[PDB]
Scaffold this active site. Structure first.
Site, PDB file in Angstrom:
ATOM      1  N   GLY A 118       0.750  -1.167   0.005  1.00  0.00           N
ATOM      2  CA  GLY A 118       0.078   0.018  -0.085  1.00  0.00           C
ATOM      3  C   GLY A 118       0.975   1.368  -0.011  1.00  0.00           C
ATOM      4  CB  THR A 119       0.033   4.716  -0.628  1.00  0.00           C
ATOM      5  OG1 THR A 119      -0.830   5.244   0.297  1.00  0.00           O
ATOM      6  CG2 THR A 119      -1.164   4.314  -1.679  1.00  0.00           C
ATOM      7  CB  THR A 120       3.923   6.245   2.316  1.00  0.00           C
ATOM      8  OG1 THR A 120       4.711   5.648   1.523  1.00  0.00           O
ATOM      9  CG2 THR A 120       4.769   6.724   3.499  1.00  0.00           C
TER      10      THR A 120
END
Lengths: 233, 142
Positions: free
Chosen positions: B31-33
């Site tokens: 997933g994204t940060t």
């Protein structure tokens, strides 16, 4: 609630050219005993709605909790909670009336009369009523309890039809509300001298005046009234 | 000795691990940060939203979610699982406020979410959460 205990007496409200005014005393009556002095019976929702609740104080606190939870859940996953998706008076009244009708149909109602007063997003004045039976009606003047019998006729003299709403000003409406509150304190046994008053104006917003009192009381004529009729002195 | 210990949730491998949990962790790593920073008198949450295409409406498709009126939550991984988790957290906070009147404390809310996510690793009939969640807020203790 099957039998009300601690009760609030009356809530009065009237429209005017730029919004609505509502008022309710700060009294919690234990039947025939005025036990609790200083109980706010006007609940502000958002910056554009005021709910006046008369009747059972426990059910009033329950409705307060429900309104606060509704405000909380409206902020959930909503970036426009500040505007364009904020809680409107119509939404709040519809929710409250649905709750009242449901609790009626389950044979366990909230022993309250509720008056929702506010200004819509487009500036329209919203003033509506609901009770433990779920009856809903709208009028330029709305009152509960003794106010429906005494405060209503006075306020209707100010605004008798919808055409009179643009003519009435905020000063005239507030004076009429204060006079009706004085008349109620005169002729209602379960009333108080202290009351709170909310003005929802489409320009100035929400004005909430607390700790107001009834003044200019005519009582001098009581000194000249002697006996049950026949008695001279 | 053996094989196939990673095919069922809540099944212990001979070492003593739950491989489905680590696969969910692998899903969150993809997933994204998203970050959270505790300051002196509050917290700050930040998240990166990947612009898959320029047809996406900017400033929409929000990722940070509000719980009660004082809790913020962000998550990395499977966004729907994060929404499920914040819904359960909102229910827990509503129950806490209904019974106790005070807004739910941050340690209490954290323990509620932790017990929920843990119970999601006790049965082979449910899949572990595919999100790592950074949340928090301010209460009477700071």
């Amino acid at each position: 609630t099957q039998q009300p205990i601690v009760t609030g007496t009356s809530v009065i409200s009237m429209k005017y050219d730029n919004g609505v005014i509502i008022a309710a005393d700060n009294l919690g009556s234990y039947g025939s005993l005025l036990r609790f002095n200083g109980v706010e019976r006007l609940i502000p929702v958002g910056d554009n709605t005021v709910v006046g609740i008369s009747g059972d104080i426990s059910d009033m606190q329950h409705i307060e909790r429900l309104l606060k939870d509704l405000v909380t859940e409206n902020a959930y996953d909503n970036p426009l909670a500040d505007a364009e998706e904020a809680l409107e008076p119509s939404y709040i009244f519809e929710y409250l009336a649905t709750v009242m009708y449901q609790r009626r149909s389950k044979m366990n109602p909230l022993w309250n009369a509720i008056i929702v007063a506010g200004v819509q997003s487009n500036g329209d004045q919203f003033l509506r009523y609901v009770n433990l039976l779920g009856v809903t009606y709208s009028s330029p003047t709305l009152a509960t309890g003794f106010g429906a019998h005494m405060a209503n006729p006075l306020l209707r003299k100010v605004v008798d039809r919808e055409s009179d709403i643009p003519k009435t000003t905020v000063q005239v409406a507030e004076e009429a509300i204060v006079n009706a509150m004085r008349v109620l304190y005169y002729r209602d046994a379960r009333s108080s001298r202290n009351f709170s008053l909310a003005i929802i104006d489409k320009n100035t917003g929400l004005t909430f005046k607390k700790n107001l009192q009834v003044e200019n009381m005519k009582w001098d004529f009581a000194k000249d009234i002697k006996g049950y009729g026949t008695q001279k002195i | 000795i053996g094989t196939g210990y990673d095919l069922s949730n809540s099944v212990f491998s001979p070492d003593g691990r739950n491989f489905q949990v680590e696969y969910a962790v692998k899903a969150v790593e993809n997933g994204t940060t998203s970050i959270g920073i505790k300051c002196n008198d509050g917290v700050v949450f930040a998240v990166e939203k990947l612009i898959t295409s320029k047809l996406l409406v900017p400033q929409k498709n929000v990722k940070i979610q509000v719980v009660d009126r004082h809790i913020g939550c962000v998550y990395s991984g499977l966004i729907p699982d994060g929404r499920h988790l914040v819904n359960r957290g909102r229910e827990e906070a509503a129950s806490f406020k209904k019974l106790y009147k005070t807004p739910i404390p941050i340690p209490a809310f954290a323990d509620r979410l932790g017990q929920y996510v843990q119970a999601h690793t006790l049965y082979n009939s449910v899949r572990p959460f595919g999100v790592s969640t950074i949340f928090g807020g301010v209460d009477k203790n700071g």
